[PDB]
Amino acid sequence: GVPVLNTPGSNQFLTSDDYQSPSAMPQFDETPEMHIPGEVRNLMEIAEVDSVVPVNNVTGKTKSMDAYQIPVGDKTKPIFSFQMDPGYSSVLKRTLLGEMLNYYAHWSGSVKLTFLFCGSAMATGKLLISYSPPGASVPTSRKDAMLGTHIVWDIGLQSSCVLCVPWISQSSAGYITCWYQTNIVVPPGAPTSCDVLCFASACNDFSVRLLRDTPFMA
Amino acid sequence: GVPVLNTPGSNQFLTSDDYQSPSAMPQFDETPEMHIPGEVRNLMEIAEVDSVVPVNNVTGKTKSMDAYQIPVGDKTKPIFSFQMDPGYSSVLKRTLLGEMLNYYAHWSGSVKLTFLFCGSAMATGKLLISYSPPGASVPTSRKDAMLGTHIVWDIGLQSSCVLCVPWISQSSAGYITCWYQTNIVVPPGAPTSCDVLCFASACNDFSVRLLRDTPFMA
Amino acid sequence: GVPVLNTPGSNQFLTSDDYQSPSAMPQFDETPEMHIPGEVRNLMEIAEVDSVVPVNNVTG
Amino acid sequence: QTRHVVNFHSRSESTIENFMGRAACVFMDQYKINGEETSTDRFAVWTINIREMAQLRRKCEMFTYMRFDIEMTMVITSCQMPVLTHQIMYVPPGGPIPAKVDGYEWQTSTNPSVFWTEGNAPPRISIPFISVGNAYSSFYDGWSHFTQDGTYGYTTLNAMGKLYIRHVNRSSPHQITSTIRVYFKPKHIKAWVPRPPRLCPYINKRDVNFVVTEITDSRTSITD
Amino acid sequence: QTRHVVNFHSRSESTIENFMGRAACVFMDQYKINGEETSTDRFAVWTINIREMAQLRRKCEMFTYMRFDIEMTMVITSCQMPVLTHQIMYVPPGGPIPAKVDGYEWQTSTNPSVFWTEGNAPPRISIPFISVGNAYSSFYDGWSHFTQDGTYGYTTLNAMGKLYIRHVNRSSPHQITSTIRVYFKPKHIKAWVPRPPRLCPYINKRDVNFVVTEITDSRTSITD
Amino acid sequence: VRSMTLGNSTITTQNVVVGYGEWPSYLSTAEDQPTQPDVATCRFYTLESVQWEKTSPGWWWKFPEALKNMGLFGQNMHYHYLGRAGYTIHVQCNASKFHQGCLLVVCVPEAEMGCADTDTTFPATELTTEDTPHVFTSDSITGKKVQAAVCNAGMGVGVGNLTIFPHQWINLRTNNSATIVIPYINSVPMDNMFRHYNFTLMIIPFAPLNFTDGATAYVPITVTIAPMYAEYNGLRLA
């Protein structure tokens, strides 16, 4: 019949191939597909969902829900500060963003952060959210944070300030520090100490290349 | 199904084949190609670049940069003389021309030579550059070199004389000798002894067929 | 993929076959054919040439 | 390593078929050829489920509902004769199982089986979407038996079958101990209802029970 | 030999794909099958790089930047039984490596591996352009760690992966010593920024260090 | 005679070798956004003049970080960790009419140099001394430093066939000035300016300087670099 000749690679089993498998049950006709709500067609649709970031993950507050709460209410040291990279960072590694990025080796994109102030409706103050570029050093003072990139976030007007941090990739990252511009001003009835929740997702669109096994599972 | 029959040569591994290799990472999408300056699309684009030829490669002057310098400034013996073949010639075997030709067994083409006079701007003389055909014998005198092919290269007018030597191939070659037509005439201020650099490349287009392993590497 | 089945005569070496041999030097481009005088395209062009016949081939 | 300009724009490797559809070894087992005519060590079983090893199990728990064809390719070895021929019998969810290597179930016409002889390419058997419902459920917050009886969390919709494997050779002069490695692969996979990733380590292969684990790794202060 | 009229006009053999794209043996290694359950002599490694043997290394140093798919075909032998089946596991640059022949890394779904049984055609596995950048760099005049730390000349962009090779057979009655010959081949190769050829001999396989060599072979006088 | 000016730096010049036939250009994304300084950066940075005697074997500079203390370009290297530029390089020689000699002015992208005694490395301050040039040597040397013998310039290649790169001959018989434009050759669009040396301007005297007992005993070689189309990463939020 047809003269064929087997190339190198015949009668082998490459694990990652896409050949036509001979079906064991050919007569069998499978169940018709109904419409089920909430289809996922791409993994990066999970990374685009905001989720609470455990910024206050200090040594004794990680098995409770005090990990998610940033205590607000000393103006010389910042409120919080963390590396801005969803991989290899204790704060952003178990986020929905940071967990769908540990399945991959090459990823690059931007990341948006939402700071929801969960204090009273009468508490009023200012917080200064500074961003350092990936090469720069952290601000040691509030003035040195003001001279860089910042957003003086008035709490009494808006209760949710949104960032969008670019240049986030791996294959020495940024910083999101936060400072007391003013103290929390509060009437006699409302409580003095408040909390700030944080969030993280993919800002506009996220690029991600090389799939691997996750490190968390043992 | 389809009646096939395996020919002789099935299930063998010919080293030089061009078969469709089954890709191990099919899902993987490779990095987009940016434009990088200076693309090579053919090896003979390296042979067409001029490069300095160590004509003065005598027994004690090959580990210094005195190999490249032809001393100018006795009219009975020639200044320099060498075989005109980029293979199996000590002068032209480590040139960019002569080194991309040792990767091949069959090559044929022409070769151009540039003689850059690196003396003073006041030194003036004449040099007679004779060419012997691949069968002919070398000229023993200046007159016998004048009766063949030559170019009386006036240094005081132009400082760079270009040749183009044809019939250069292997699968008993020419000669580029050089003679004192006149001595180097020099004013009282300028130095008396000068140098002449040489160059070599492919003249118009170069033909080359059978790839092999280079002899230099051990 | 394509369901094939090997017939009798697979993986054999018939001496007189005309199959596509895998070329060992694929990059190699052979020398161009010049015109050489006196091409033979058929053996019976040799038989049509006269030649002297040894009729007197006696024992000595 | 150093931080490079990772400049490209692609999410083709983040789709569901390029995330789940990867072959992974899910079942090693030994099975002899001779001796002990009534023994359970002359064949393999492996009830097919996604909760086999925790690396793949974690990926299937990104999503609540998913449907997919499976295309497994076995890799069978041998130790210690003639040329050996094997049999990999897939029984459907409604199917009789053998009790011994010489049971009559092995001859059931409704149980498809491949007869792979040693030396060739590995045997590949593909199984369509069997389930009664419209998708396989990774999680089932419900009770199998009505009125809150036993067996929490186990629905019968996400039953995929079993995979009985034996030598077809009746006997041998010496002992031959074959090893099989089943390479499971989802194919033509769709997935619904995303779900947060697993945080705690896995305890058992039929339940969701866990030990309370910390959220993230701890650091010294909030500002360092 | 004699000087003939070498009359033809061709430079198809001087293109980059017809100059670099040639299969050359770059890795011989031995690996046993049994004994020494915790040993490093039961599998092979070969971190994939172009700086393997000096004959090929010299050709890749004609050019500063180049990008190419690689398509290697192993040639596996054996000495001293059953029919043997091997496993050639390519791990990507981001990939876990085995420490022993029985490590769990061998079962990683993201590490593609071929299971070649003895007697068939040689196994062929093809790997695309992996690198993070836009080309592989033959030379890197720079430091891996910022602020001029150690490890000169080694960038992480030109990392290609590794190639772990073992027997899949768990044991054997006698000793079997297999030999593998990896045939590396660049494919679909582009090359930028030409570069002068190497003059001095090579010292070490991870650096450009050299001994000062003479330019050409010496002759007696300038005129002979 | 053309008096070029860029910003607040004017030089006086007297044909350009565009490296690899390409003129430097900008990179043209909201995920990563470059900043184009344009202001300053493009001015002429004249290095210290280099005296070329009869026994000088050569010099080399390693860029981009040879300009690490040169004004705003050397200050934007500390604030941005990614960048790229073009580096128009003028090389005058202003010798007399009775001096003779010849120079090879070549740029050599990715000049990975070799240690002097192999089996070890060099302490990273031997490749570059910012502004000042490391000279070559006439013979072999030992010690934990760069094998700076000419005939094997840095890379173990022949020094004669170093002409494959963007080059220019300065023959004092004919000309005195050289100019080379090097359009950022690299495998990644932007890279750090302290880790990676994009190219190595090395000036190598093939024909040695010569003169008589009345002339000046040296010829000062003047090097001038203009970083063109320098762009950096973004520091602002998106």
PDB file of C-alpha atoms in Angstrom, chain B residues 34-38 45-46 49-52 62-65 68-69 94-96 99 116-124 155-159 187-195 197 199, chain F residues 19-20 22 27 57 84 97-102 138-140 150-151 158-165 167 169 171-174 183-189 204-208 210-212:
ATOM      1  CA  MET B  34      11.412  42.224  19.150  1.00  0.00           C
ATOM      2  CA  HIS B  35      13.637  43.905  16.582  1.00  0.00           C
ATOM      3  CA  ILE B  36      17.284  43.558  17.652  1.00  0.00           C
ATOM      4  CA  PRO B  37      19.819  45.533  15.570  1.00  0.00           C
ATOM      5  CA  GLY B  38      22.339  43.722  13.412  1.00  0.00           C
ATOM      6  CA  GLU B  45      28.104  38.576   5.459  1.00  0.00           C
ATOM      7  CA  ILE B  46      30.958  38.062   7.938  1.00  0.00           C
ATOM      8  CA  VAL B  49      33.954  42.656   6.457  1.00  0.00           C
ATOM      9  CA  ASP B  50      37.509  43.952   6.188  1.00  0.00           C
ATOM     10  CA  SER B  51      39.885  42.935   8.962  1.00  0.00           C
ATOM     11  CA  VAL B  52      43.577  43.459   9.598  1.00  0.00           C
ATOM     12  CA  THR B  62      52.939  37.004  16.752  1.00  0.00           C
ATOM     13  CA  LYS B  63      51.849  37.478  20.382  1.00  0.00           C
ATOM     14  CA  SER B  64      52.140  41.278  20.064  1.00  0.00           C
ATOM     15  CA  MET B  65      50.499  43.754  17.700  1.00  0.00           C
ATOM     16  CA  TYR B  68      49.871  43.538  11.795  1.00  0.00           C
ATOM     17  CA  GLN B  69      52.497  46.188  10.986  1.00  0.00           C
ATOM     18  CA  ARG B  94      42.878  33.579  10.966  1.00  0.00           C
ATOM     19  CA  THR B  95      41.255  36.495   9.123  1.00  0.00           C
ATOM     20  CA  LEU B  96      37.476  36.867   9.228  1.00  0.00           C
ATOM     21  CA  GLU B  99      38.203  31.752   9.384  1.00  0.00           C
ATOM     22  CA  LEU B 116      46.388  51.422   4.419  1.00  0.00           C
ATOM     23  CA  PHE B 117      49.609  53.433   4.693  1.00  0.00           C
ATOM     24  CA  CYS B 118      49.875  54.471   8.351  1.00  0.00           C
ATOM     25  CA  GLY B 119      52.832  56.842   7.991  1.00  0.00           C
ATOM     26  CA  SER B 120      53.092  60.592   8.307  1.00  0.00           C
ATOM     27  CA  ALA B 121      51.090  63.107   6.300  1.00  0.00           C
ATOM     28  CA  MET B 122      54.398  64.412   4.899  1.00  0.00           C
ATOM     29  CA  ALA B 123      56.101  61.133   3.942  1.00  0.00           C
ATOM     30  CA  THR B 124      56.079  60.472   0.208  1.00  0.00           C
ATOM     31  CA  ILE B 155      51.733  57.075  -1.216  1.00  0.00           C
ATOM     32  CA  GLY B 156      51.859  60.879  -1.297  1.00  0.00           C
ATOM     33  CA  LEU B 157      48.650  61.142  -3.335  1.00  0.00           C
ATOM     34  CA  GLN B 158      46.451  58.318  -2.013  1.00  0.00           C
ATOM     35  CA  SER B 159      46.998  56.428   1.241  1.00  0.00           C
ATOM     36  CA  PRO B 187      60.977  66.315   5.544  1.00  0.00           C
ATOM     37  CA  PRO B 188      63.283  67.040   8.510  1.00  0.00           C
ATOM     38  CA  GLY B 189      60.421  67.047  11.028  1.00  0.00           C
ATOM     39  CA  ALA B 190      58.586  63.831  10.240  1.00  0.00           C
ATOM     40  CA  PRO B 191      59.864  60.375  11.250  1.00  0.00           C
ATOM     41  CA  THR B 192      61.638  58.151   8.751  1.00  0.00           C
ATOM     42  CA  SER B 193      60.135  54.695   9.393  1.00  0.00           C
ATOM     43  CA  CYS B 194      56.455  54.065   8.653  1.00  0.00           C
ATOM     44  CA  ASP B 195      53.977  51.177   8.725  1.00  0.00           C
ATOM     45  CA  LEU B 197      48.394  47.864   7.404  1.00  0.00           C
ATOM     46  CA  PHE B 199      43.047  44.154   4.976  1.00  0.00           C
TER      47      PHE B 199
ATOM     48  CA  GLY F  19      26.214  51.047  14.140  1.00  0.00           C
ATOM     49  CA  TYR F  20      24.424  48.153  12.399  1.00  0.00           C
ATOM     50  CA  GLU F  22      20.138  51.607  12.588  1.00  0.00           C
ATOM     51  CA  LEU F  27      10.712  51.655  22.426  1.00  0.00           C
ATOM     52  CA  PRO F  57      48.815  49.572  23.982  1.00  0.00           C
ATOM     53  CA  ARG F  84      18.314  52.416  27.413  1.00  0.00           C
ATOM     54  CA  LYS F  97      50.934  67.133  10.781  1.00  0.00           C
ATOM     55  CA  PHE F  98      54.271  65.439  11.567  1.00  0.00           C
ATOM     56  CA  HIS F  99      52.804  62.810  13.907  1.00  0.00           C
ATOM     57  CA  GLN F 100      51.915  59.427  12.438  1.00  0.00           C
ATOM     58  CA  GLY F 101      49.789  56.568  13.682  1.00  0.00           C
ATOM     59  CA  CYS F 102      46.500  54.747  13.397  1.00  0.00           C
ATOM     60  CA  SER F 138      51.602  44.687  25.653  1.00  0.00           C
ATOM     61  CA  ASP F 139      52.181  41.195  27.086  1.00  0.00           C
ATOM     62  CA  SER F 140      50.498  38.687  29.396  1.00  0.00           C
ATOM     63  CA  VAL F 150      46.391  43.082  23.138  1.00  0.00           C
ATOM     64  CA  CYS F 151      46.272  40.472  20.344  1.00  0.00           C
ATOM     65  CA  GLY F 158      42.188  38.034  17.516  1.00  0.00           C
ATOM     66  CA  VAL F 159      42.558  41.781  17.882  1.00  0.00           C
ATOM     67  CA  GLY F 160      43.057  42.280  14.145  1.00  0.00           C
ATOM     68  CA  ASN F 161      39.631  40.938  13.183  1.00  0.00           C
ATOM     69  CA  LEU F 162      37.891  43.121  15.755  1.00  0.00           C
ATOM     70  CA  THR F 163      36.621  45.115  12.755  1.00  0.00           C
ATOM     71  CA  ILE F 164      33.358  43.127  12.579  1.00  0.00           C
ATOM     72  CA  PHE F 165      31.817  45.540  15.104  1.00  0.00           C
ATOM     73  CA  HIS F 167      34.300  50.658  14.018  1.00  0.00           C
ATOM     74  CA  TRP F 169      39.857  54.021  11.711  1.00  0.00           C
ATOM     75  CA  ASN F 171      44.632  57.471  10.459  1.00  0.00           C
ATOM     76  CA  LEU F 172      46.518  60.622  11.436  1.00  0.00           C
ATOM     77  CA  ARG F 173      47.748  60.876   7.848  1.00  0.00           C
ATOM     78  CA  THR F 174      44.196  61.553   6.624  1.00  0.00           C
ATOM     79  CA  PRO F 183      21.425  51.919  18.817  1.00  0.00           C
ATOM     80  CA  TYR F 184      21.128  50.000  22.116  1.00  0.00           C
ATOM     81  CA  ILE F 185      21.903  46.381  21.282  1.00  0.00           C
ATOM     82  CA  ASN F 186      20.325  44.117  23.916  1.00  0.00           C
ATOM     83  CA  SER F 187      18.089  41.044  24.171  1.00  0.00           C
ATOM     84  CA  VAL F 188      15.563  42.695  26.538  1.00  0.00           C
ATOM     85  CA  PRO F 189      13.963  46.096  25.780  1.00  0.00           C
ATOM     86  CA  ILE F 204      43.481  50.228  20.046  1.00  0.00           C
ATOM     87  CA  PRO F 205      46.577  51.683  18.284  1.00  0.00           C
ATOM     88  CA  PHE F 206      47.490  49.353  15.431  1.00  0.00           C
ATOM     89  CA  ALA F 207      50.227  51.450  13.927  1.00  0.00           C
ATOM     90  CA  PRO F 208      52.142  52.971  16.852  1.00  0.00           C
ATOM     91  CA  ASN F 210      55.916  58.024  15.992  1.00  0.00           C
ATOM     92  CA  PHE F 211      57.574  61.439  15.830  1.00  0.00           C
ATOM     93  CA  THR F 212      60.980  63.096  16.088  1.00  0.00           C
TER      94      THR F 212
END
